[PDB]
Design a protein around this ligand. Sequence first.
Ligand SMILES: NC(=O)C1=CN([C@@H]2O[C@H](COP(=O)(O)OP(=O)(O)OC[C@H]3O[C@@H](n4cnc5c(N)ncnc54)[C@H](O)[C@@H]3O)[C@@H](O)[C@H]2O)C=CC1
Ligand SMILES: NC(=O)C1=CN([C@@H]2O[C@H](COP(=O)(O)OP(=O)(O)OC[C@H]3O[C@@H](n4cnc5c(N)ncnc54)[C@H](O)[C@@H]3O)[C@@H](O)[C@H]2O)C=CC1
Ligand SMILES: NC(=O)C1=CN([C@@H]2O[C@H](COP(=O)(O)OP(=O)(O)OC[C@H]3O[C@@H](n4cnc5c(N)ncnc54)[C@H](O)[C@@H]3O)[C@@H](O)[C@H]2O)C=CC1
Ligand SMILES: NC(=O)C1=CN([C@@H]2O[C@H](COP(=O)(O)OP(=O)(O)OC[C@H]3O[C@@H](n4cnc5c(N)ncnc54)[C@H](O)[C@@H]3O)[C@@H](O)[C@H]2O)C=CC1
Ligand SMILES: O=C(O)Cc1ccco1
Lengths: 281, 278, 278, 278
Amino acid sequence: NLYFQSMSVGFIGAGQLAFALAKGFTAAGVLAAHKIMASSPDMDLATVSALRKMGVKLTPHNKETVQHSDVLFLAVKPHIIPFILDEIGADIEDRHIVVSCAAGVTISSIEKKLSAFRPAPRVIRCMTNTPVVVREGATVYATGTHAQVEDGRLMEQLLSSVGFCTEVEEDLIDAVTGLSGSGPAYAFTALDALADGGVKMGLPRRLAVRLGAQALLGAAKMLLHSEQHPGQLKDNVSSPGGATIHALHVLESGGFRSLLINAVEASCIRTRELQSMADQE
Amino acid sequence: FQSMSVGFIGAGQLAFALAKGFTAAGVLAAHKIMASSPDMDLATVSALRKMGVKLTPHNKETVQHSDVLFLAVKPHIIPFILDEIGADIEDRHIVVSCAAGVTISSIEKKLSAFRPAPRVIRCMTNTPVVVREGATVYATGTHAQVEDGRLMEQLLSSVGFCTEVEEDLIDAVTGLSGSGPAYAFTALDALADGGVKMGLPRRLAVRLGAQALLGAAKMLLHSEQHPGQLKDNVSSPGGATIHALHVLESGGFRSLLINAVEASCIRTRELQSMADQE
Amino acid sequence: FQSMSVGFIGAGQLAFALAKGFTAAGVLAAHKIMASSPDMDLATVSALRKMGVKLTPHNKETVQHSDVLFLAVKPHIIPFILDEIGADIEDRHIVVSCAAGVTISSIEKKLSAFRPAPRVIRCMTNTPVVVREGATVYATGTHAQVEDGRLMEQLLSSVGFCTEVEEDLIDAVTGLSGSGPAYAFTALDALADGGVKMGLPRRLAVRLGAQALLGAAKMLLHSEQHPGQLKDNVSSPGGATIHALHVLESGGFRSLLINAVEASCIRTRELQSMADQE
Amino acid sequence: FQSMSVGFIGAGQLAFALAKGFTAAGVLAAHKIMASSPDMDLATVSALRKMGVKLTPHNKETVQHSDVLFLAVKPHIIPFILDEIGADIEDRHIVVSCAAGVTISSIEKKLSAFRPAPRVIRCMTNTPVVVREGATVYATGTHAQVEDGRLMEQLLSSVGFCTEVEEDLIDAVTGLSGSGPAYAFTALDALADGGVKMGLPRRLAVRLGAQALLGAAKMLLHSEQHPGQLKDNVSSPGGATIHALHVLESGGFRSLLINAVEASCIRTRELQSMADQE
Ligand SMILES: NC(=O)C1=CN([C@@H]2O[C@H](COP(=O)(O)OP(=O)(O)OC[C@H]3O[C@@H](n4cnc5c(N)ncnc54)[C@H](O)[C@@H]3O)[C@@H](O)[C@H]2O)C=CC1
Ligand SMILES: NC(=O)C1=CN([C@@H]2O[C@H](COP(=O)(O)OP(=O)(O)OC[C@H]3O[C@@H](n4cnc5c(N)ncnc54)[C@H](O)[C@@H]3O)[C@@H](O)[C@H]2O)C=CC1
Ligand SMILES: NC(=O)C1=CN([C@@H]2O[C@H](COP(=O)(O)OP(=O)(O)OC[C@H]3O[C@@H](n4cnc5c(N)ncnc54)[C@H](O)[C@@H]3O)[C@@H](O)[C@H]2O)C=CC1
Ligand SMILES: NC(=O)C1=CN([C@@H]2O[C@H](COP(=O)(O)OP(=O)(O)OC[C@H]3O[C@@H](n4cnc5c(N)ncnc54)[C@H](O)[C@@H]3O)[C@@H](O)[C@H]2O)C=CC1
Ligand SMILES: O=C(O)Cc1ccco1
């Protein structure tokens, strides 16, 4: 029974993440689509067309998003953030809460830009993922220097309506990016391959996709609802000498676990490397 | 309002998961379920008992109690079971075998020596029925009535996805969604290790990794888009995700999952070939 | 335009391919093209002559003839060429650099020492322009006029795909479509070896393999569907194609192609840093 | 001929692709084509209807309509189909089996039980016939007339490359050009991932990669030169392309493509031995 009646939300950038969050928020019923505005220099993108059909207000001008909004999501690529902040920094008012969703971009770098125009900008950094579109996102956030206590509580209330949300120290966010930010892509890759395996063994593709995705969804839910270690839940599936333990062995023989560790590491490291380039630039 | 009595021959992991799912769905009262095992010292048996399920060592009592009778013992036990209680199967019974690899033909051959038209259904499910997100398929036997298949689909749809298949798909289903949760638990453990390696507390890394997988699976189930397209929507040019996807590809990540589904399916077939040789 | 004169500094593989494509397309008569090379006894020089292209050893002659001037020499020769003809560039000239890696900045710096505001365009194309199926991108320089980009796009579209990009994408395009034909020739040689191993005559295996790759590429270009969806359409359950796809996955086939694009792009960037260092 | 009526038993991917190609080519009006499938609520069935193709659930109707009858069902359904329509084949009919692996011998044996001297042709094609760039081979049966092969070659040439082969080459052709589009779709997906990793937008990377592969394939088909010579032409000394070729070689890129052709051919042979065993 949550609803932010006095909240106007804006998105700078009207791409995949802006669509995903706007769809999640509106499906959650916590925001009316007409209370959301999004801006982009390309009003002929597929994401803009979808936002328009939801009822979201669209404009090419970032200043109009700022003037309309109370909560301002920065949903542009990381290298575009500094250009955006210089463009609308003079338009940031006392009432604004600036929420950066950009991978890698630090609170410090955002506050430095905006503070040149008006002291004490209220900044929150978040990392989320596309499953907010089905209200099953994984979101962490960190509060900036001038964010009020109620700013973080409000953002946690808003982002909890589209999935899991918790506050973290900012120095964890690049690692979260490599785990749950990039995580859905790992899962889509795994599901494509599991379906290929189903097809190889005789299943129609449509059924193999549905079963593989259902298997992954159910296993993730079991772990989230259980206090047992993932190894114990695994032991419950595998009968002695059975089909599952035979399959687990061939995963182990290929270093399956190490590949997923490799992936989280590589995404985290790249996130740190890109920001180190941005700060040197 | 069915007042259906359900029995499980076998009181292990699957019987517990199904019983927990059915009672949480509200389709069955726990005390309308009876389960039998010769080993009451199992943890699964104590959980079933705590739920309020009726427990007995005697498989005949389970049969006489049941309207729908699940066979939840290990595949090599099924023929012993059918010899033992085949005389107790009645015309009213629907026999649902959950055993990996065991064919409808092998079951009907045993039971037909007693009464002539045993109603047999074969199913393959998985442990997430315990949270009502199972993936279940079933095939109907020679004498199963149209209403038997519909009843079975109503029942198993209460604990997750359920669909009828031809029996010759079920071994492949076993390798995919039957064994699938174990592949996911392995992946989630490793994803969490990667989170920990990069500085996350273990508890948070497990939570985030599992939420990521749940969300991605739901996205795919709710999308008409190809999983490759959903993947392309995550990865921006030059970005973190595409760098991570590259290291997965360099290890043959896709081939490992194909290998797993194949290995489980083949083992399922190989066991049954040895079973029907005996 | 019809009255448009085109020149090539460098009369080698790329100049031949572009001139063959342009004249085959009908957008340029061969007699409107001049090419220069210091060795007039070259195979490409002979081929260009037979087509009707004007040839000369003097790069100054090419400049004086041309309106649109392509630079088709190896990248380390570009600075030498610019110093040789810089005093000969007029305001009518559009200088189109085809050299891998060489930046508009480096070209404009050399030419601006002679006459301010050189009109420079940088492009990256590939040898299939010779059969009018090239893949070309281009970026406009500081003083290139809007019509200059439109003229270049009209010209290069006659021999394949052409689109404007920001210059900072061109090194990656080089690794993908610039080097791409070489990846395909390697793949076609190996696919033909596979056909021969399985009993096909070499000539038939080459023809079938090349036709399969051409057809598949055209399907993808004409489809809105994801390449994985088109792949799914071809793989029947249990069939030959999904069996072969597995062995590709088990070798990390995908990661090798990613490796190749990356290695070509990185080498392109490295060669240009070496150029700028001096 | 114009008065030629064509039928498809099986209204799935292949039947759609051939009918789309035939009608796009102008060799057949859609109203001269009938296709049959037991599920008239299929995506391919709908698409065929919009094109103007006559649809029916009755395979007998297709036979009665057709002069040239394509068999486009899965290989394990061919014997069932032949038993269903065998009594309906006339002397006017040319039966063209597209099924992977299925021998002319097995088809002629089933049809000869109903009427002697069935005119049978076996072909292997691929889905790029949908854009008129297929690769097709065919072998003529015992009672096929000389004009029957010439008619089939004229028809299939309208949608791509077509040549007659001895039947014992067709399983290897299946592994090369039959499965080949799937190898190319995998390669194009991975090449696009490489472009994205190096900073290209996904849509541009897909377009460039597909255009590069199409252009290279067309170059090879139009050249008399060896694919290694064309590769040599593209690799400048010390350059980006030869650096990328090295990383392909270091992964055994060539051996993976050989592996794939082999695995598809062997699986084709194995499936047909399973067919003949029963
Ligand atoms: N897609 C994902 O999986 C997630 C993305 N993010 C972050 O969200 C941000 C956007 O991600 P996507 O939405 O995937 O990018 P996207 O590329 O789909 O959308 C980017 C949007 O920015 C717009 N844009 C470019 N220049 C602009 C300007 N000067 N002013 C306003 N808009 C401008 C583009 O037109 C486009 O609509 C990135 O910083 C990314 O790291 C964070 C979590 C997950
Ligand atoms: N655990 C899983 O993930 C799934 C298992 N299955 C199938 O379910 C069946 C059992 O699986 P689990 O429950 O995991 O095995 P489990 O080993 O946990 O329990 C097996 C039960 O059979 C009982 N049992 C042994 N001999 C018996 C007899 N003569 N009469 C009655 N009960 C007897 C054991 O005491 C134990 O309670 C197997 O056929 C397996 O293939 C199917 C889907 C998934
Ligand atoms: N062939 C390819 O695959 C593509 C090549 N390119 C670029 O095009 C340029 C040339 O490529 P290729 O034609 O393959 O090289 P190539 O070596 O076949 O031709 C080079 C030509 O430059 C001539 N030349 C050398 N010094 C000269 C001078 N001082 N004045 C005039 N001409 C001189 C040589 O005599 C030769 O005719 C390179 O920068 C390459 O990066 C770009 C697109 C694709
Ligand atoms: N798609 C490809 O890549 C190529 C396929 N082929 C061969 O063509 C045949 C079909 O290929 P796809 O069209 O990909 O299969 P598909 O599964 O897309 O279409 C199969 C069609 O057969 C229909 N069907 C099933 N039982 C039937 C029956 N009793 N009577 C009539 N129709 C029935 C199905 O309803 C479906 O419409 C296979 O033998 C395959 O080997 C050969 C060349 C290339
Ligand atoms: O691993 C085994 O044999 C049991 C099983 C069947 C399906 C999933 O697990």
